């Protein structure tokens, strides 16, 4: 008889300041009753939103998982919880006559966020190459993977979450990896394929609001 949506309120979740677009969507939460509070069931929510919805002109195949942390003034505050590429984007570059280098690193920012970064790269057929395949030898693969790992470490461990996401928006990490590995073996489609949050520092409203600076 009584539909539950008559006991439900709508909040306007928001993104941090490093994104051009602030309002990224709404969210439904039931009204507070009993021991249940409207916020504890709202903090643990993750929005998988395309980057093109958070930047005026950027790639649409990059997705950011933003997790709510509190609700101030019926506005849900979100921070960076993950970064991915779309399934079709990843599948559209795994061709069958090149080698794929998959590097990854557990690294920590200067502010205490522990991130696992996954970088993927694909060897590039030269514009004058006749040979069908563009494989790299195992030592070449190892050198490329080591360069990826050290570049990711030097580009995340020297920074904190805000500037790490700022350089993730245009994926400057992938461009740096490509220009470094060009000397070893030319690479074609290099990106930080994924970023996942392993452990993060204690919750603090100060840093949260400082992110929306």
């Amino acid at each position: 008889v009584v539909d539950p949506f008559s006991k439900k309120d709508w909040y306007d979740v928001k993104a941090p300041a490093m994104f051009n677009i602030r309002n990224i969507g709404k969210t439904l939460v039931t009204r507070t009753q009993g021991t249940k509070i409207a916020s504890d069931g709202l903090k643990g929510r993750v929005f998988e939103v395309s980057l093109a919805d958070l930047q005026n002109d950027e790639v649409a195949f990059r997705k950011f998982k933003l997790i709510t942390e509190d609700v101030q003034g019926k506005n849900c505050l979100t921070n960076f919880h993950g970064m991915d590429l779309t399934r079709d984007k990843m599948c559209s570059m795994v061709k069958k006559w090149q080698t794929m280098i998959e590097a990854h690193v557990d690294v920590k920012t200067t502010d205490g966020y522990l991130l696992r970064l996954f970088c993927v790269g694909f060897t590039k057929k030269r514009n004058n190459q006749i040979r069908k395949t563009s494989y790299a030898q195992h030592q070449q693969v190892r050198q490329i993977r080591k360069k990826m790992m050290e570049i990711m470490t030097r580009e995340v461990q020297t920074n904190d979450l805000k500037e790490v996401v700022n350089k993730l928006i245009p994926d400057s990490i992938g461009k740096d990896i490509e220009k470094a590995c060009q000397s070893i073996y030319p690479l074609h489609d290099v990106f930080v394929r994924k970023v996942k949050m392993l452990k993060k520092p204690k919750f603090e409203l100060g840093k949260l609001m400082e992110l929306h600076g």
């Binding site: 949506f5 969507g25 969210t27 643990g44 929510r45 929005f47 399934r87 079709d88």
Partner: protein, 135 residues
């Protein structure tokens, strides 16, 4: 009381399309996905188990979900469709295209389209035996 949709803006939802080969699930949730708004499957319309996957059941389910979402405020939808995944078939059932098109024809605005099929990294053994289904 309800949503705060502006005059020209559209509020968004996320549509999960489980296009198996036994029936089609049309699911709608918040952008997060944590709050389920309304879910109608292909087996909620027809009682022919052969017909649970057929495109007509998907059309009926998608039109029902579009009506319920419109009466609940949501006007635009994000698309996140899946097959059975796992070790089983990695292809949408016969109702994925039909359900998507029925949502589009019901006056909905389609947002982004993504595939959320569970793709293992060579996970556990497939259901079929060594020789497979011999029928």
């Amino acid at each position: 009381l309800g949503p705060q949709v502006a005059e020209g803006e559209n509020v968004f939802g996320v549509c999960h399309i489980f296009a198996s080969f036994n029936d089609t699930f049309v699911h709608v949730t918040d952008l997060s996905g944590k709050e389920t708004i309304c879910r109608v499957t292909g087996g909620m319309k027809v009682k022919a188990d052969r017909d649970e996957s057929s495109p007509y059941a998907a059309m009926l389910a998608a039109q029902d979900v579009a009506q319920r979402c419109k009466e609940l405020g949501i006007t635009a939808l994000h698309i996140k469709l899946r097959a059975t995944g796992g070790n089983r078939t990695k292809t949408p059932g016969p109702g994925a295209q039909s359900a998507l098109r029925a949502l589009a024809r019901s006056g909905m605005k389609i947002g982004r389209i993504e595939d959320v099929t569970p793709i293992p990294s060579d996970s556990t053994r497939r259901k079929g035996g060594r020789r497979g289904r011999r029928l």
